[PDB]
Write a protein that binds this ligand. Structure first.
Ligand SMILES: Nc1ncnc2c1ncn2[C@@H]1O[C@H](COP(=O)(O)OP(=O)(O)NP(=O)(O)O)[C@@H](O)[C@H]1O
Ligand SMILES: [Mg+2]
Ligand SMILES: [Mg+2]
Ligand SMILES: [Mg+2]
Ligand SMILES: [Mg+2]
Ligand SMILES: [Mg+2]
Ligand SMILES: [Mg+2]
Ligand SMILES: [Mg+2]
Ligand SMILES: [Mg+2]
Ligand SMILES: [Mg+2]
Ligand SMILES: [Mg+2]
Ligand SMILES: [Mg+2]
Ligand SMILES: [Mg+2]
Ligand SMILES: [Mg+2]
Ligand SMILES: [Mg+2]
Ligand SMILES: [Mg+2]
Ligand SMILES: [Mg+2]
Length: 337
């Protein structure tokens, strides 16, 4: 692919379609830097990467505490329908502290793209975001390119030295679109209706993020849309390529526990290397308390029972609230004492 796309501070505040034109704005920005960069870009050389050591603070208590992210990390978000994945995304943008946010919405309905644009228009981060989208009326090629364009905009901000958060919602529809392109090129379905080339191409896309020795980072969140145990190689491919997954539980969602993150089914694979030992001990104590609260949910013992409302109160977090690290750990501290 020879296609270049616009990059620069000029795009901050902009809503961009798969063809590169601006079709709405959620903020206007003084700078009008516009340059061009390729949408196909190799990931960094291993020699160019910095170790993930500094946390990417989300402002989300259950994550910052039990599933701490690292700057330069790739994190999966796995969710079935209506478990609040879009709100989680909005939260991760709002309550974090990145310099730049780049969002890529792939094959969503026009109503879904407008929720996000509506969200940005009302957010403090508006001056810091770029939104790229391909609504469901767009072709497979356009859905794919929307993901590349988004990544390429993040890449440019990273080379500038910035601390960038990339969001791709969803890889599921990205892979479906990539599949159709492959089928139309005459490729054969391998195992599930996907030709083998779409899974083979995934590492190249999903390894473009990361921390650079030279300065700057992309921390990336990729959503994977789950069916209710219906017929999911894509999820297991993504689980294996990223370094962590946040699982959204429908049980917790219907129950009202938002964000419906199931810590037992989630992991950050950089956890240990981005939090100190006091955090680790405190977090592991908290997980012990959790698994002890689940032993009760099978229907001293009464003491952990009284710890439930304070725990649930720790987990639950209205999408409009953000918590500092100190606030979150302060709260963890109280539930384990
Ligand atoms: N943290 C939260 N605080 C408050 N309300 C929440 C929260 N999370 C979810 N909700 C509620 O749940 C809905 C959020 O749905 P949404 O975030 O779009 O999930 P979704 O998985 O993206 N839906 P879909 O994309 O079509 O599968 C809203 O109608 C809210 O009322
Ligand atoms: Mg850029
Ligand atoms: Mg453009
Ligand atoms: Mg280094
Ligand atoms: Mg955990
Ligand atoms: Mg939604
Ligand atoms: Mg969103
Ligand atoms: Mg819809
Ligand atoms: Mg169209
Ligand atoms: Mg098509
Ligand atoms: Mg095969
Ligand atoms: Mg890295
Ligand atoms: Mg890893
Ligand atoms: Mg939430
Ligand atoms: Mg609340
Ligand atoms: Mg608060
Ligand atoms: Mg903080």
């Amino acid at each position: 692919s020879h296609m270049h796309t616009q990059v620069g501070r000029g795009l901050l505040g902009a809503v961009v379609n798969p063809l590169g034109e601006v079709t709405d704005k959620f903020a206007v920005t003084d700078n009008s830097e516009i340059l061009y960069r390729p949408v196909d870009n190799a990931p960094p050389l291993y020699s160019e990467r910095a170790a993930i050591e500094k946390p990417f603070l989300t402002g989300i208590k259950v994550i910052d505490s039990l599933l701490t992210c690292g700057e330069g990390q790739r994190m999966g978000i796995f969710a079935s329908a209506g478990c609040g994945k879009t709100f989680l995304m909005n939260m991760l943008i709002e309550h974090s502290g990145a310099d730049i946010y780049v969002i890529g919405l792939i094959g969503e309905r026009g109503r879904e793209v407008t929720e996000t644009v509506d969200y940005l228009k009302n957010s403090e981060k508006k001056s810091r975001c770029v939104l790229v989208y391909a609504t469901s009326d767009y072709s497979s090629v356009d859905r794919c390119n929307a993901a590349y364009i988004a990544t390429a905009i993040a890449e440019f901000f990273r080379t500038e030295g910035h601390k960038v958060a990339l969001f791709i919602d969803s890889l599921t529809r990205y892979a479906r679109a990539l599949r159709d392109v492959a089928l139309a090129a005459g490729e054969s379905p391998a195992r599930r209706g996907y030709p083998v080339s779409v899974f083979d191409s995934l590492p190249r896309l999903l390894e473009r993020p990361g921390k650079l020795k030279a300065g700057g980072s992309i921390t990336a969140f990729y959503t994977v849309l789950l069916e209710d145990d219906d017929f999911d190689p894509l999820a297991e491919e993504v689980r294996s390529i990223l370094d962590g997954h946040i699982y959204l539980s429908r049980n917790l969602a219907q129950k009202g526990q938002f964000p419906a993150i199931d810590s037992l089914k989630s992991i950050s694979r950089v956890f240990t290397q981005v939090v100190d030992e006091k955090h680790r001990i405190m977090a592991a104590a908290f997980r012990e308390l959790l698994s002890e609260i689940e032993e009760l949910r099978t229907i001293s013992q009464d003491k952990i029972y009284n710890k439930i409302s304070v725990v649930e109160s720790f987990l639950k977090q209205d999408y409009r609230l953000g918590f500092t690290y100190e606030q979150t750990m302060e709260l963890i501290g109280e539930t384990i004492r």
